[PDB]
Amino acid sequence: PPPSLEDAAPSVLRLSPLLRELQMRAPVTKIRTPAGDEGWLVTRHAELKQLLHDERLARAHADPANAPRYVKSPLMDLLIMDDVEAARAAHAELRTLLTPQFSARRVLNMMPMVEGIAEQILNGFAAQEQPADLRGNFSLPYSLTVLCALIGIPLQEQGQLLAVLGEMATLNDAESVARSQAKLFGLLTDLAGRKRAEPGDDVISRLCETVPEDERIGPIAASLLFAGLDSVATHVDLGVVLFTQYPDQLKEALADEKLMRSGVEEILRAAKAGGSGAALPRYATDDIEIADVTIRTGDLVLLDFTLVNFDEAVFDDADLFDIRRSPNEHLTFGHGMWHCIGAPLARMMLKTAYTQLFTRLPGLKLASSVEELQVTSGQLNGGLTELPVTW
């Protein structure tokens, strides 16, 4: 029986020993998923990068109901279709719709909105009673408010979102996920009809121009919001932890915009809970020969973007936080057909956050120890349960 991927990591910002062992054993290796099934874990940079460009991996399985699962989640099950050409076309359309929204030009047009929301939230955060949770008081409201503004979700309708998005991340209750997913899909399909009638400068309105069916705009906007919210918030949090542990690198990043940009890359490479970094399931649509192994049609393949970021064949002293790594060859956003569509926004949001946070609160420090930080578990893209800081 293959080793089981565990529920989190023993502590934050260090790769879990089980993952480091799996990586040493083989480039592609059989594991047991949290959901109990068997799967291929890709553990090394060169092999992951090659498989990110292999057309034989798809979000498709001949029998999705019986396909080997990564996690027990009705969210993943919406992702997997039973025809390959139908899955390929659905994926292709998602990227065609969304890639223009995140061009360098359009992201540049988001900067004032992002900086302005960060300043309003930071104004309130600096006044909180200390120690204060940076995640609930800053990084989550920051991420939620920017993403809702860009997508076009009214301030008047945001109250219920943090509850529904958090529930959708649960691996603990299958029926609570599915009805939260429908609440969110229903909220945003309803919203799409309203913005069709009254368009604004936002993503939902621009999708209306090209997509005439509300019932398919809503799930795209919902999955856009779910894709960005926690990941951006968690990287604000862990980026803040790293910078409080290497204050000399924080100060030089504040002093030179080149080093703040490469500092954000080094946070994207290393600011990790240390647990399993695979995000979505992929299935072989044909047999693939690689790394002295044979992946078979229907097999589950897990691309662990976090784990390959610590591959010593690529990164000198990989456990070390060093913002001067350049070029920084992390694969945190994927690559090729699968590459994160929000990467330019995420990069800009993180740079905005660290700059404003540490300029306004230069004495920002952990209330307790890094070892005392509690990584969340039993969840999709959980990060920390809270991050108490003082300043």
List residues binding ligand 4UH (CB under 6 A): 8, 34, 59, 71, 75, 78-79, 90-91, 94, 219, 223, 227, 231, 272-273, 275-277, 279-280, 306, 377, 379-382
Taking CB under 6 A as the rule, which mask of x and - marks residues 73-112 in contact with ligand HEM? Answer: ------------------x--xx--x--------------
Vertex 42 angle, CA 40 and 43, to 5°: 130
Which C-beta is closer to ligand HEM: that of 305 or that of 391? 305
For the purposes of burial, counting CB atoms within 10 Å of the CB of 181, is it exposed (0-12), middle (13-18) or buried (19 or more)? buried
Which C-beta is closer to ligand 4UH: that of 334 or that of 391? 334
Task: Name the pairing type of β-strands 293-295 and 288-290.
Answer: antiparallel
Tell me the H-state helices in the chain.
17-25, 45-51, 74-79, 84-98, 104-108, 111-125, 134, 140-151, 161-168, 174-197, 203-210, 214-245, 247-255, 257-270, 305-308, 343-360
Residue 272 interacting partner from ligand HEM, ligand 4UH, none (CB closer than 5 to 8 Å by kind) = ligand 4UH
Taking CB under 6 A as the rule, which mask of x and - marks residues 347-386 in contact with ligand HEM? Answer: ----------------------------------------
How far is the C-alpha of 143 from the C-alpha of 118, rounded, in Å?
9
Q: Is 194 annotated as a binding residue?
A: no
Residues 132-151 that bind ligand HEM (CB under 6 A): 147
Q: How far is the CB of 335 from ligand HEM (least distance, A)?
A: 9
Q: Is 280 annotated as a binding residue?
A: yes
Which C-beta is closer to ligand HEM: that of 195 or that of 282? 282
Taking CB under 6 A as the rule, which mask of x and - marks residues 281-310 in contact with ligand HEM? Answer: ----------------------x-x-----
Q: Is 340 annotated as a binding residue?
A: yes
Residue 340 binds to ligand HEM (criterion: CB under 6 A): yes
Token couple for 128: 């909180």
Q: Is 208 annotated as a binding residue?
A: no
Count helices and strands (H / E) in the chain: 16, 10
What sign does the dihedral 105-161-73-63 (CA atoms) show?
Answer: negative
- DSSP label of 7: S
Q: Tell which residue, 38, 35, 39, 85, has the closest CA to residue 62.
A: 85
Q: Which residues contact ligand HEM (rule: CB under 6 A)? A: 91, 94-95, 98, 147, 224, 227-228, 231-232, 235, 279-280, 303, 305, 332-334, 338, 340-342, 345-346
